């Protein structure tokens, strides 16, 4: 990062690599999906896990595509 994005860039840690957040997002959705393997008999919670995992995957994919096409940096 530079000054215009983070004004206090030289005053401390202000940059986090995008790969960590993208991989962490995929692992976040993977952890949501694997939790369907449990002793619960109901499926209402299973659909909530699927929806959140899909939302996280969509956000990660949207950010990766925008970063690849150069729309955002």
């Amino acid at each position: 990062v530079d000054v215009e994005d983070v004004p206090s860039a030289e005053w401390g840690w202000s940059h986090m690599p995008i790969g960590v957040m993208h991989i962490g997002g995929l692992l976040s959705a993977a952890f949501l999906l694997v939790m369907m393997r449990g002793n619960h008999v109901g499926h209402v919670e299973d659909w909530f896990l699927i929806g959140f995992a899909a939302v996280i995957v969509a956000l990660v994919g949207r950010n990766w595509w925008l970063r690849r096409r150069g729309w955002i940096r």
Binding site: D2, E4, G70, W71, R73
Partner: protein, 143 residues
């Protein structure tokens, strides 16, 4: 002298209007291509700490002298780089301020012209300017 529907305010500002359903900018280029050019101009100047300018239009009889006067309109002329392209004259002129001298622009000025020219034979105007800005901004050090 003002256009239809345009008025001069008390503070000197111009209050203009446009007919409904019409555009106020109407640049003859696609919106997405303009965004890419802005990103090249904004990010290229940021990584170079020198304002980058793009001009499209006539350059008179002598293209070299015309670009010198045009650069005066660019904010902070001393630290500004102007790329002038004349589609009718088929000429490319690059002019930079005094502060840009000695910063590595002399090796990137022909680089931008050649890169822009190569894309100009293909019928791509915005693409040529985008390519010229990228290579010219990548050969200029901060400050």
């Amino acid at each position: 002298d003002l256009p239809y529907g345009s008025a001069l305010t008390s503070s000197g500002r111009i209050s203009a209007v446009t007919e409904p359903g019409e555009l106020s900018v109407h640049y003859p280029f696609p919106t997405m291509d303009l965004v890419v050019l802005d990103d090249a101009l904004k990010y290229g100047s940021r990584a170079a700490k020198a304002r980058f300018a793009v001009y499209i239009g006539p350059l008179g009889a002598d293209t070299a002298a015309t670009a010198r006067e045009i650069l005066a309109n660019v904010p902070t002329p001393e630290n500004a780089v102007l790329l002038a392209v004349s589609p009718d004259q088929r000429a490319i002129e690059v002019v930079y301020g005094a502060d840009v001298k000695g910063r590595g622009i002399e090796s990137a000025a022909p680089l931008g012209v050649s890169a822009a020219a190569a894309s100009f034979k293909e019928g791509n105007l915005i693409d040529g300017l985008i390519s010229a800005v990228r290579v010219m901004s990548a050969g200029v050090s901060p400050a």
